[PDB]
């Protein structure tokens, strides 16, 4: 029993983190086989960051301009290239700790673990779900650029996120490991800001099923609703539309609990209209939307507790 | 910026987790140097669990009754002994991945990371703070016994918790690594239940300082209060008393933010008396008490954002 915001065990990723220094800038890199991946803005001065042409900045560098430190060992840089917003530093040694891995791009509403790192040294691990507006609500301090986000699927690490910057609302923006930004953000100094966000409805429904599996049942009701009438209330409260594919995805949780998806939808409508009246669900006084149906199934493989 | 419930990177602990099987029971063990530590209830049948005499049960076992599997390698058990509620299995191989470590007992109100494991395989990592009533609100399914809780101090792992059982309210009870239970709980089947709990006041104040460091300021006020008058309101809302040592501990956060501890106390009193009026703090609609002052300082080393 119990329900926690749980991250994947981080060891496989810790064994890949290195420190990359160029000039007076230090940030983190990801060392897989004989390549080190990091944000290309490592090659920028502050004046550069104002309006950089990275192809120009990079042609003025050589391999020896990049100091890579893996723990207590300096790695010899033997090639460099740019792929979109990431720099690829070819090094003369393959990382003996490389896990099985893939570079996957995730969708808004999906979750991943973040290994926050400073100076190539891991400092903490937490779960973060990509927001509909393609930002993440992370916890990052100066120096954390290059920290990565990932899921682990069996023994395979799917990297999905590399951290690049903080937007003015305090939320975070970055790229996939192909260097393509999530969202309409750029690695240069502009007035760029997060667009409007919405709540991830399928996740909120998943979390209500988690609550039922864990014995919180006060919000259930006898009512049902139709998909269209539900989505009419969703729109009003800045919730994403629920689709038939979402309903299908919630199938297993519905079956385990014996609560139809559209019945749980009627509970959610009531919660949106009435609030909680001083009660909590799984320790929260707000409706939580950063657990996907898969996250709930993985963590709640336990008894439904009728 | 940002504030997340962050766990310590788990690799150093992942490298110590093994599977311990006795009879038809499998649970997790912790392999440090040439010893494997696990819950002694691994030696119990269900009928045994009803009312066991563990000294009797253990004298009837031999080394070959214990199968230890470290990944794909069976470890040869060459000695066994009991220390309080933990079993110590001496094995013929020292774990080459043993970190620098210590066995520390923590205090109620302190936090730690949990590496939830099944069949010797790590499945997730999350942050859990020992409650005043010596339970933890974890996320554990059958098979998770033997999973450990820990802090990491530089490269040294301080183990503080081994998981043993779930109480009827769905909260979790266990021991330090010396096998001494936290709280008035026993590793046998009884009607045992969690005693009444309270909120960890110093942690709530720490988290309010985190909120200020992160730009949530709506709950601040011009008022102050005295320590005694504050503790008079605390008692009424099931909050622990605040001590002068707690105030001293909050010193650095008070200095960074320029908000006196007793002024922040007046904000907390107002929040307790009035609620939040539909607003949130650091993404929560409840006052959070599972971050210690040290956790806030470690994660918020960042700009105060005046
Ligand atoms: C990373 O450690 N800091 C981010 C500073 C650079 C942002 C400009 C794109
Ligand atoms: C651990 O995996 N399960 C706990 C079952 C035994 C509890 C009796 C003390």
Swiss-Prot record, chains A, B:
Effect upon mutating residue 49 to A: Does not affect ability to cleave and inactivate human TRMT1
Crosslinked positions (Glycyl lysine isopeptide (Lys-Gly) (interchain with G-Cter in ubiquitin)): 5, 90
UniProt effect for mutating residue 145 to A: Complete loss of 3C-like proteinase nsp5 cleavage
Result for mutant: residue 205 to V: In strain: Zeta/P.2
Spans within the Cytoplasmic topological domain: 1-306
Domain Peptidase C30: 1-306
Chemical reaction(s) catalysed: TSAVLQ-|-SGFRK-NH2 and SGVTFQ-|-GKFKK the two peptides corresponding to the two self-cleavage sites of the SARS 3C-like proteinase are the two most reactive peptide substrates. The enzyme exhibits a strong preference for substrates containing Gln at P1 position and Leu at P2 position
Record's signal peptide: none
Activity-regulation annotation: Inhibited by pyridone-containing alpha-ketoamides compounds 13a and 13b. In turn, alpha-ketoamide 13b (tert-butyl (1-((S)-1-(((S)-4-(benzylamino)-3,4-dioxo-1-((S)-2-oxopyrrolidin-3-yl)butan-2-yl)amino)-3-cyclopropyl-1-oxopropan-2-yl)-2-oxo-1,2-dihydropyridin-3-yl)carbamate) inhibits SARS-CoV-2 replication in human lung cells. Inhibited ex vivo by michael acceptor inhibitor N3. Inhibited ex vivo by compound 11a and 11b.
Subcellular location: Host cytoplasm; Host Golgi apparatus; Host nucleus
Active-site residues (renumbered): 41, 145
The protein's assembly and partners: 3CL-PRO exists as monomer and homodimer. Only the homodimer shows catalytic activity. Interacts with host FBXO22; this interaction promotes the proteasomal degradation of nsp5.
Function as written in the Swiss-Prot or TrEMBL entry: Cleaves the C-terminus of replicase polyprotein at 11 sites. Recognizes substrates containing the core sequence [ILMVF]-Q-|-[SGACN]. Cleaves and inactivates human TRMT1, preventing tRNA guanine(26)-dimethylation of tRNAs. May cleave human NLRP1 in lung epithelial cells, thereby activating the NLRP1 inflammasome pathway. May cleave human GSDMD, triggering alternative GSDME-mediated epithelial cell death upon activation of the NLRP1 inflammasome, which may enhance the release interleukins 1B, 6, 16 and 18. Also able to bind an ADP-ribose-1''-phosphate (ADRP).
Descriptive protein name: 3C-like proteinase nsp5
Organism (species): Severe acute respiratory syndrome coronavirus 2
Positions spanned in the full protein: 3264 to 3569 of 7096
């Amino acid at each position: 029993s119990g329900f926690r915001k749980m991250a994947f065990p981080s060891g496989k990723v810790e064994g890949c983190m290195v420190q990359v220094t160029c000039g007076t800038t230090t940030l983190n890199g990801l060392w897989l086989d004989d390549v080190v991946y990091c944000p290309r803005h490592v090659i920028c001065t502050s004046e550069d960051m104002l309006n950089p042409n990275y192809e120009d900045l990079l042609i003025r560098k050589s391999n020896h301009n990049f100091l890579v430190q893996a723990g207590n060992v300096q790695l010899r840089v033997i090639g460099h290239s740019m792929q979109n917003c990431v720099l690829k530093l070819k090094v003369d040694t393959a990382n003996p700790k490389t896990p099985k891995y893939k570079f996957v791009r995730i969708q808004p509403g999906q979750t991943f673990s973040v290994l926050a790192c400073y100076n190539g040294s891991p400092s903490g691990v937490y779960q973060c779900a990509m927001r509909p507006n393609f930002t993440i609500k992370g916890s990052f301090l100066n120096g954390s650029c290059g920290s990565v986000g990932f899921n682990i699927d069996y023994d395979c690490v799917s990297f999905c996120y590399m951290h690049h910057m903080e937007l003015p609302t305090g939320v975070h923006a970055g790229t996939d490991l192909e260097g393509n930004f999530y969202g309409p953000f750029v690695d240069r100094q502009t007035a760029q800001a997060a667009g409007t966000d919405t709540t991830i409805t399928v996740n909120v429904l998943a979390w209500l099923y988690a609550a039922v599996i864990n014995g919180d049942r006060w919000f259930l009701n006898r009512f049902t609703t139709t998909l269209n009438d539900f989505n009419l209330v969703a729109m009003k409260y800045n919730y994403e539309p629920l689709t038939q594919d979402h309903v299908d995805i919630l199938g297993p949780l519905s079956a385990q609990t014996g609560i139809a998806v559209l019945d749980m939808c009627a509970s959610l409508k009531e919660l949106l209209q009435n609030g909680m009246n001083g009660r909590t669900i799984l320790g929260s006084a707000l409706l939580e939307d950063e657990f996907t149906p898969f996250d709930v199934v993985r963590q709640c493989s336990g008894v439904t507790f009728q």
